[PDB]
Every structure is written in C-alpha cells, then in structure tokens.
Short mmCIF file of C-alpha atoms in Angstrom, two decimals:
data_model
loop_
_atom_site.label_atom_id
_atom_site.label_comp_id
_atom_site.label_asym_id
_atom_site.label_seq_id
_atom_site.Cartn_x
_atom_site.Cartn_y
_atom_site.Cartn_z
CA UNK A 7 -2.39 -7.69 -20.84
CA UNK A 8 0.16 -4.99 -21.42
CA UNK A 9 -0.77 -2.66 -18.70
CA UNK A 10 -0.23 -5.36 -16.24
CA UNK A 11 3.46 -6.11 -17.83
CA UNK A 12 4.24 -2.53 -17.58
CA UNK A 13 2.95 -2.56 -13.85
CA UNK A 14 5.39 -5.45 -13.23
CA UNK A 15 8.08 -4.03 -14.70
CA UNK A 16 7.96 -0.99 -12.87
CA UNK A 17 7.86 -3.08 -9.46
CA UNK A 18 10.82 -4.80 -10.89
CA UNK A 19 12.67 -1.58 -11.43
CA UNK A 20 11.85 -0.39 -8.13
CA UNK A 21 13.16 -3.53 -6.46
CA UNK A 22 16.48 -3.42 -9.28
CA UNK A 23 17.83 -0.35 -7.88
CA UNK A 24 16.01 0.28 -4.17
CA UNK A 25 17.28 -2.57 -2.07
CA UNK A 26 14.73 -3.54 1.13
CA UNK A 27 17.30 -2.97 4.26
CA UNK A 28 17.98 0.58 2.80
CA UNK A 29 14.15 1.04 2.59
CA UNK A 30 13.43 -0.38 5.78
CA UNK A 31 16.05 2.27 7.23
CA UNK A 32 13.99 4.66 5.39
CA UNK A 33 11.04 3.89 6.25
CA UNK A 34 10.84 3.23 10.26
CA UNK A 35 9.63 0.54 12.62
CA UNK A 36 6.40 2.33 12.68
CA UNK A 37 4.00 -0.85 11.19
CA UNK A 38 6.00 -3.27 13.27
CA UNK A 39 5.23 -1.41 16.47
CA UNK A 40 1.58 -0.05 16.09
CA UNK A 41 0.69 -4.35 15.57
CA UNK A 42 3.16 -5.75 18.53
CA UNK A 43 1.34 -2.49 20.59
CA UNK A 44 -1.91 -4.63 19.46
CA UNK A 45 -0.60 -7.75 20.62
CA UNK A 46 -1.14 -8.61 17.00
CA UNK A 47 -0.26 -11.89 16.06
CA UNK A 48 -2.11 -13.35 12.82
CA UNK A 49 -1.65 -11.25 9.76
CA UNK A 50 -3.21 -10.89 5.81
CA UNK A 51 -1.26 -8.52 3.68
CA UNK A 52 -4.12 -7.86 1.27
CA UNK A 53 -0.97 -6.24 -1.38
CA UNK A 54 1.63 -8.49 -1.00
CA UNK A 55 3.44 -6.91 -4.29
CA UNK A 56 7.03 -7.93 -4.53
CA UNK A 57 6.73 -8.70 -0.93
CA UNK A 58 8.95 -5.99 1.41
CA UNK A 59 5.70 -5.51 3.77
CA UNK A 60 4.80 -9.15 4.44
CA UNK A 61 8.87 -10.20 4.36
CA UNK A 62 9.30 -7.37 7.31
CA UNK A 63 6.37 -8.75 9.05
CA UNK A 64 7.85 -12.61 8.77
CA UNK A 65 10.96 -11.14 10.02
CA UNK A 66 9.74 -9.83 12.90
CA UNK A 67 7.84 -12.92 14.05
CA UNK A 68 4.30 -12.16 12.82
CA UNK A 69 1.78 -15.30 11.38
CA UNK A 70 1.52 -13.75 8.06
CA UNK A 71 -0.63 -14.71 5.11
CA UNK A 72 0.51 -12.97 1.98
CA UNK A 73 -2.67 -12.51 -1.23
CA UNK A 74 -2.21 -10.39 -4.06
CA UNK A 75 -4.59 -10.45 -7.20
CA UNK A 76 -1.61 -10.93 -8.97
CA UNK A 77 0.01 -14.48 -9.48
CA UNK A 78 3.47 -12.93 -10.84
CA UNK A 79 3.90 -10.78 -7.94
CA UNK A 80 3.29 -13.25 -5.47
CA UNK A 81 5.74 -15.39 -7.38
CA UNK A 82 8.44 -12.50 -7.11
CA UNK A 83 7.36 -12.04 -3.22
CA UNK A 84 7.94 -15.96 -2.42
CA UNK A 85 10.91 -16.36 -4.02
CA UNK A 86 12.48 -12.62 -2.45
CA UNK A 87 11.01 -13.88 1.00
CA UNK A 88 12.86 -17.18 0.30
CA UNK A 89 16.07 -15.14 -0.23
CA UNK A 90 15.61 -13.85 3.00
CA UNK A 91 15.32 -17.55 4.73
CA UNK A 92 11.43 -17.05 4.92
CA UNK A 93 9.05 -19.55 3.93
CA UNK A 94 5.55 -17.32 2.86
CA UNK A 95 2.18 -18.31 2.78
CA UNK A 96 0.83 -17.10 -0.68
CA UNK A 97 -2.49 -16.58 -1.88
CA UNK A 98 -3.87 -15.03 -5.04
CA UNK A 99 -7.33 -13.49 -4.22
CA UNK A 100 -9.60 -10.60 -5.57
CA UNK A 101 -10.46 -7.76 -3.31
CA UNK A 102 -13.91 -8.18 -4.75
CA UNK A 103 -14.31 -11.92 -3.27
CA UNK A 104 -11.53 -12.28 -0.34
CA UNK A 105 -12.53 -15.01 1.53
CA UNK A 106 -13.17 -17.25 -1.62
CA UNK A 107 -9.79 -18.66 -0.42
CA UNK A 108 -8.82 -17.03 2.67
CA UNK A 109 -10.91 -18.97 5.58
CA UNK A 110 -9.14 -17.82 8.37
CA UNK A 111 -9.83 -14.67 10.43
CA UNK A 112 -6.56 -12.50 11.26
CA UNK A 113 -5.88 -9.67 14.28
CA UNK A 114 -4.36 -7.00 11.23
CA UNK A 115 -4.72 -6.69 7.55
CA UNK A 116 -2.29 -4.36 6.00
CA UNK A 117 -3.04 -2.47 2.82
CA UNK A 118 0.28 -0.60 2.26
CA UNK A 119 2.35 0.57 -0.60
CA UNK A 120 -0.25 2.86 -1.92
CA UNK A 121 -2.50 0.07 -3.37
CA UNK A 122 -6.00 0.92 -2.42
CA UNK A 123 -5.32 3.93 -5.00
CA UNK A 124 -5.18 1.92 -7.63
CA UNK A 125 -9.04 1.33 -7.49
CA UNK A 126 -11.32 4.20 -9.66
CA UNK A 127 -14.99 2.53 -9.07
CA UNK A 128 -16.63 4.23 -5.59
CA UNK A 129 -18.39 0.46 -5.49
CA UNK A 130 -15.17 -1.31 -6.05
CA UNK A 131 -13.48 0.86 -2.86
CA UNK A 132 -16.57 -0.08 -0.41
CA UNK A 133 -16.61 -3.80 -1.61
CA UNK A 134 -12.79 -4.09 -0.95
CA UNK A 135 -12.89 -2.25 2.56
CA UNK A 136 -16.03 -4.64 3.38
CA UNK A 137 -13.93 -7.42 2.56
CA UNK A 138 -11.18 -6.50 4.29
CA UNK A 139 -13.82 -5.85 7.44
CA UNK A 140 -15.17 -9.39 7.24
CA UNK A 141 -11.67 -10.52 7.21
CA UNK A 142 -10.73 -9.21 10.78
CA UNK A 143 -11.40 -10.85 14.05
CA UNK A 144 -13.83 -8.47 16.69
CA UNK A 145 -10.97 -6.77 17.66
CA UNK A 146 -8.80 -6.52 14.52
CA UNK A 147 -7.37 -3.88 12.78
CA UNK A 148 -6.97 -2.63 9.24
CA UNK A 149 -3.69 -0.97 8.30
CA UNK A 150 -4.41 1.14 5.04
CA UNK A 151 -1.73 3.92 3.29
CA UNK A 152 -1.50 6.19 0.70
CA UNK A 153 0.09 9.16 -1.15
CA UNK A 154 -1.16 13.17 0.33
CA UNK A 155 -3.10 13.94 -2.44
CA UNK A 156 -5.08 16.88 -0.70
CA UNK A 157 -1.43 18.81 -0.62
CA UNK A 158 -1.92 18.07 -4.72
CA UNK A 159 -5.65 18.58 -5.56
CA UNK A 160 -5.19 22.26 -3.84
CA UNK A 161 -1.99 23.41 -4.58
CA UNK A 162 3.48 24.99 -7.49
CA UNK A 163 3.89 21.28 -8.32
CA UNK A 164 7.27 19.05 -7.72
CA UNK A 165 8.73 15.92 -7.52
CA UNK A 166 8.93 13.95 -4.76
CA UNK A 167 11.98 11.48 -4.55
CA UNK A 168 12.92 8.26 -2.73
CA UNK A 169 15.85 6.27 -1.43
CA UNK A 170 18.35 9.43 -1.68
CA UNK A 171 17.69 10.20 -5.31
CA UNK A 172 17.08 6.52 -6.82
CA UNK A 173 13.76 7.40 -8.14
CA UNK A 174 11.81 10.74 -8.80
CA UNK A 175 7.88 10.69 -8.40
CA UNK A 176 6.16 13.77 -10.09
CA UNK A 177 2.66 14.61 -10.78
CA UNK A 178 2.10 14.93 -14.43
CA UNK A 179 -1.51 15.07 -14.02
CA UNK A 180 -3.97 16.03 -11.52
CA UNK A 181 -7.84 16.33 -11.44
CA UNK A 182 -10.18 15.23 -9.16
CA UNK A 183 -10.50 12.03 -10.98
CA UNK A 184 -7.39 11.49 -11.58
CA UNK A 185 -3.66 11.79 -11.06
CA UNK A 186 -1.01 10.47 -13.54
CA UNK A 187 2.69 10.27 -11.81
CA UNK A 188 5.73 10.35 -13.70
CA UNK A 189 8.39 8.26 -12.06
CA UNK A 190 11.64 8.64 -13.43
CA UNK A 191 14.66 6.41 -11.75
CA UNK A 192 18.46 7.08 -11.67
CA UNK A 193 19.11 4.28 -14.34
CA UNK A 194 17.13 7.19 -16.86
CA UNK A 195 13.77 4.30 -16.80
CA UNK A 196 10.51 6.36 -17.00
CA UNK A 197 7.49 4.91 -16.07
CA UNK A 198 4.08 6.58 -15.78
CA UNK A 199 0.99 4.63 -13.99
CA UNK A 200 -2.53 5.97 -12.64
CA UNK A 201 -4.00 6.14 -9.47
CA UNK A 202 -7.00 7.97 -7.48
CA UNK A 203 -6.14 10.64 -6.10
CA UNK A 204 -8.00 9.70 -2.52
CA UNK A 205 -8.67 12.95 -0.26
CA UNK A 206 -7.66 12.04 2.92
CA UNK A 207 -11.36 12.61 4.82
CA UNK A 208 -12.51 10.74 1.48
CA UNK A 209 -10.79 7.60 2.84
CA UNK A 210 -11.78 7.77 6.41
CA UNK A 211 -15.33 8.22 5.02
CA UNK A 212 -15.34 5.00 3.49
CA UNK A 213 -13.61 3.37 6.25
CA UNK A 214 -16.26 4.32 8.87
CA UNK A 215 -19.39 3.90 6.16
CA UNK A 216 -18.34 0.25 5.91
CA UNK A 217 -18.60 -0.15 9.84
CA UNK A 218 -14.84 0.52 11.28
CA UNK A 219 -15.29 2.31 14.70
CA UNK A 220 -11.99 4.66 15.34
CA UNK A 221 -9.80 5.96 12.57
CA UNK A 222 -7.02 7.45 13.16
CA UNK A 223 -5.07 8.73 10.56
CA UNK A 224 -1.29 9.55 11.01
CA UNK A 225 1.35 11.74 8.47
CA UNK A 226 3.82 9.09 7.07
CA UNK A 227 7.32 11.03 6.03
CA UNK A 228 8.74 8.72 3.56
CA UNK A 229 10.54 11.20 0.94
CA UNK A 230 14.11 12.05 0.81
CA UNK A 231 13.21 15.74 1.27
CA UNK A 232 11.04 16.31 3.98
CA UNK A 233 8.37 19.19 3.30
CA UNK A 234 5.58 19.92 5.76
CA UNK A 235 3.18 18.02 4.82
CA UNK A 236 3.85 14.32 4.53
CA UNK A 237 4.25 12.59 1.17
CA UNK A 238 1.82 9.46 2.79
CA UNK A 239 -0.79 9.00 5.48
CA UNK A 240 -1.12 6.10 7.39
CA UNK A 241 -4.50 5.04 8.62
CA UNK A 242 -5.29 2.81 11.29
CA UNK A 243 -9.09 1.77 11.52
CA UNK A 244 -10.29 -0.39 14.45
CA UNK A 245 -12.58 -2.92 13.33
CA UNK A 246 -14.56 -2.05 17.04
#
C-alpha cells in the first residue's frame, strides 16, 4: 500500500521538477541508435514508469508496446505520451508472467531507468530475464540498465546529482544486500527507496545463464559531474 504511494510520489517529483527534453539533452541518442543500428522495429518497454523511455521511442518512429506492473504509472505514461501527440499502447503485466497478456513477439525489450534493481529474490531476477527472453524474436535484443554499484560496494562516498543540480542521489546505505539512496531534490523533498545493489559481472551472469548469447556491457555517463567511472551501465544482450 504505502510503499507503492511513496514510490509514485517520488516518480511524480522527479517528473515535477526534471522536464523530458532537458533529460533527453542529458541523456544522448544512444538507445535510439543502438535499435535503428538493429533495424529494430517492434518494441516492449518492460518499465514503462511515467513513460520518458517508451514516449522517446514513439517519437522516433518505433512500434512500441508500453507494460508496467503498475496501473498508476501507466496511467501517468498515457496521458504524458498523449501530451506529447502520442497515442501508447499500455499494458499492465508482471515480470513473473509476461506473456499472460503480451502475445506478440518484439525485435527489443528495454529495461531502463534502473528497474531491474528493484528486484531482491535471485529467483525473481532469472524468472524476469527468462521472460523477457521468451519475449524476443530469434534475433532480438534486450536493452537492460542500471546504477555502478561495484564503484560503491568497494569504495569515500558522495552524491551523485542530475539535471544540473535538480536532484541529489546519495548512498545512505550500502552492503552487499543492500543499498538505501537518499535522494534529495532542489524543492528540499527527500525521498529514500531500496534497490540491489547488482555487481556489474553479477548481471551479465544472469543474462547469459538464462540463454542470451553476446553481452556487451557499455559505461552510461548520466550525472551532472562526470567522475571516471560511470554513474550507469548499459547492457545490451543478444538474444542469439
């Protein structure tokens, strides 16, 4: 109950004060090109959240078929891709049980935002990435980010910040198991949410355990100041 009211709130708080053509500036073209490199033309966002990733994909022409397990979000990504003259296809679905009402088969599914994170059962992760592998045509290909949290795990802690300084993301709390982030915006709203703090070789380990062939895994710079390491990876695992 609550903890999915505070989850929306902080989406809506994002969205309040980090407007999408300033975070498409900020982030690049790079999702857009590796698919139209593909010739990718059918795609499921499998975390549709408020929507920027599957409104950016409708913009630039892709066939894209928006879930979320959440039916508030997708109603905040429909109406935000209306606002941008989009019509989206919405779909709420669980990870656990994708194609219960998704009966197509699509050349990408993207994973993005940090949202595979979010999951702290080892079964749950291989059940979702074997979903997402049934999902994809022979030669599809899954799209999957997330935070750095090796730089993290083995390191002198800081905060990591976003659209110039709109919002400040901090780790409050690390272990192996765990990592709590503090994220404190420019309006003086605090919000503080879990996640998994996924090793980088963890995740390609459970993307080629399910059965995807090539992974390749590329440093995403998405924070206002750039350190060495990036603040996200991006990987990109070939179905075959």
């Amino acid at each position: 109950h609550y903890e999915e009211e505070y989850v929306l709130g902080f989406v809506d708080k994002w969205d309040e004060l980090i407007d999408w053509e300033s975070r498409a500036e900020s982030e690049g073209d790079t999702i857009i090109n590796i698919l139209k490199e593909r010739g990718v033309k059918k795609v499921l966002d499998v975390a549709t959240g408020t929507g920027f990733n599957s409104v950016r994909l409708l913009q630039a022409g892709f066939d894209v078929v928006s879930a979320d397990g959440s039916a508030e979000m997708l109603v905040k990504a429909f109406d935000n891709a209306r606002d941008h003259g989009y019509l989206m296809r919405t779909v709420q679905a669980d990870w656990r049980w994708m194609n219960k009402d998704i009966h197509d088969k699509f050349d990408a599914i993207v994973c993005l935002g940090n949202s595979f994170t979010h999951l702290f059962d080892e079964g749950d992760r291989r059940k979702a990435l074997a979903e997402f592998y049934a999902l994809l045509k022979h030669d599809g290909v899954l799209l999957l980010d997330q935070r750095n949290y090796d730089a993290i795990l083995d390191d002198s802690k800081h905060a990591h910040y976003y659209c110039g300084d709109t919002v400040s993301v901090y780790p409050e709390h690390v272990d192996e198991g765990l990592a709590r982030f503090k994220y404190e915006f420019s309006d003086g709203s605090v919000y503080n949410l879990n996640m998994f703090p996924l090793r980088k070789d963890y995740t390609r380990q459970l993307l080629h355990e399910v059965g995807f062939q090539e992974i390749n895994t590329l440093g995403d710079f998405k924070e206002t100041y750039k350190e060495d390491e990036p603040d996200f990876f991006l990987h990109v695992a070939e179905k075959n």
